[PDB]
Amino acid sequence: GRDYEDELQSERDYVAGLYARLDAERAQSQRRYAAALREHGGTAVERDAEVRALAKDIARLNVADNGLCFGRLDTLDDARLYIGRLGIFDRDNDFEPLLLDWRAPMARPFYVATAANPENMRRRRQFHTLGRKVVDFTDEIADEAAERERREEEAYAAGVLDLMVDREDLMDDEDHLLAQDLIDAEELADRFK
Amino acid sequence: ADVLVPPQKQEILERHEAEADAIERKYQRGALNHTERNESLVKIWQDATEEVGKALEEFYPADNPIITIVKSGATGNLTQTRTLAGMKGLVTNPKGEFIPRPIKSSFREGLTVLEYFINTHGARKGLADTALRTADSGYLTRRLVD
Amino acid sequence: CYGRSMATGKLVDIGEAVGIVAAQSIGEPGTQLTMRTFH
Amino acid sequence: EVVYDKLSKRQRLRVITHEEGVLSDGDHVEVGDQLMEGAADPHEVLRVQGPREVQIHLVKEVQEVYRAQGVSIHDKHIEVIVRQMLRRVTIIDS
Ligand SMILES: [Mg+2]
């Protein structure tokens, strides 16, 4: 269809813009996480925290890099509310919703399909995108070893701890916290397996 | 009187607080979820801290004692300086997670109380993590020597 | 094959220990890294 | 022809890096090539490449790790911990 074709192409341009936005945020978060990993200026805790956070972010981004948009919910009230497997908003235009998350409460009317009982939805298009390009318009109006293993690991970690200096031998400003009183050999073993 | 505050700072904070208000709306309007909201706020305030940093080091003179102590690689970073004259910024829960309520006050303008009762969590967390770090290091080292 | 001992700047001397130096060089800055959490 | 068709949708692909997008189709890939962004198996590399591409792999990975965190170390100190991991052979045929 000529109209189907023009639409399909416009929606493809829209999704390509969304994907370019995504790629930009991806490079941004990557660079930020890199330069926080290297120096970060501050101290450990904040550095590790920022790192884990930007890692979660890079995940949340990449996880949806193939099949981001799920469809549309053009509403009765001359208004649209696109959908996808992520959240994307125009930080400038007062966070107008360009792409809700499939979990949101405003995106529950992507799974209610009745015999003319819509909340405020009139048209509904479930796109058959492959990974990055829209195709369809779809209107829907031996418990012996383990013992010795674990015991040898416990003993190795106990030796590790006995290896570090102790408070009866320190040469520091004031008695601070030490490995020997925050974690036990057995957890220092669990956390390397 | 040598620890200088940049004057392009309050504009910044009001702008970004307006953005945060918009997000609060998008949360109350059923258009978003809690944790993604907090992530968005985090993004915004990190951007604001970066802006503050660039403005600060665009405003300080070239002969200032602090900037000279830093730029000569002797001591410190521009994060310490930003926090001493700009805004400490976001801080962490005891679970590592960030908080969307930042610290918009520096160690010169003077912190408030509740902008000071959330700055402890990470401090104690770090003063305890140091020892475990030393322990894992000793472990790796004893192994590599074995 | 080793080359020069970075401490001296000249070639390495027979009888030197170079398996310990490596472990120390490595595990000294191991504090400056991003370990897993502890919760 | 060999096939690795159990490829989770979670991991995306290898970025082609041909001057920058997802790995293409009908593209050249060598014996020692990856097919999904992440980390390989040193044992895989040893069974399919040998004791000269797995040592390099280990050194490269360890040093890039130590390099993205503000640290400076040589490689003749990593290549002394590796040499001590391929000095023994499991004997299939006596
Ligand atoms: Mg001291």
Number of domains observed in the structure of chain B: 1
Helices (H), chain A: 2-38, 44-62, 145-163, 185-190
Q: Do D69 and C32 touch (CB under 8 A)?
A: yes
B146 falls within a domain? no
Q: D45 in contact with C at a CB cutoff of 8 Å?
A: no
B145 falls within a domain? no
Which CATH number do you get for residue B78?
1.10.132.30
Report the relative pairing of strands A96-101 and A83-90 from DSSP bridges.
antiparallel
Residues belonging to chain C with any Cβ–Cβ distance to chain B shorter than 8 Å:
19-20, 22-24, 26-28, 30-31, 35, 37-39
B138 falls within a domain? no
**H or E segment and range at residue C22:** helix C19-27
Q: Do C34 and A191 touch (CB under 8 A)?
A: no
Total CB pairs under 8 A between chain C and D = 31
Cα(A175) to ligand 1 centroid in Å equals 10
Was C23 annotated as part of a binding site?
A: no
Domain extent for B42: 8-129
Way the structure was solved: cryo-EM
Tokens 């080091």 belong to residue: B57
Q: Could you give the CA distance from residue A78 to residue A81 in angstroms, rounded to a whole number?
A: 11
Q: Are the C-beta atoms of A72 and A14 separated by less than 8 Å?
A: no
In units of Å, what resolution does this entry have?
3.4
B122 falls within a domain? yes
**Exposure b/e, B51-87, CB count within 10 A at least 16 = b:** bbbebbbeebeeeeebbeebeeeeeeebbebbbbbbb
The closest CB to that of A37, out of C34, C35, C36, belongs to C34
Residues belonging to chain C with any Cβ–Cβ distance to chain A shorter than 8 Å:
34-38
For ligand 1, a single-atom ion, which residues have Cβ within 5 Å?
Answer: A 173
CA B122 from centroid of its chain's CA atoms:
12
Q: Is A190 helix (H, G, I), strand (E, B) or coil?
A: helix
Would you call A112 exposed, middle or buried from its count of C-beta atoms within 10 A (0-12, 13-18, 19+)? Answer: exposed
Q: Could you give the CA distance from residue B80 to residue B46 in angstroms, rounded to a whole number?
A: 15
Residue of A nearest to D22 (CA): A65
- Residue A18: closest CA among A75, A73, A67: A67
B14 falls within a domain? yes
Q: Provide, as residue numbers in chain A, all residues whose Cβ is less than 8 Å from the Cβ of C37.
A: 48, 52
Q: Could you give the CA distance from residue B38 to residue B12 in angstroms, rounded to a whole number?
A: 19
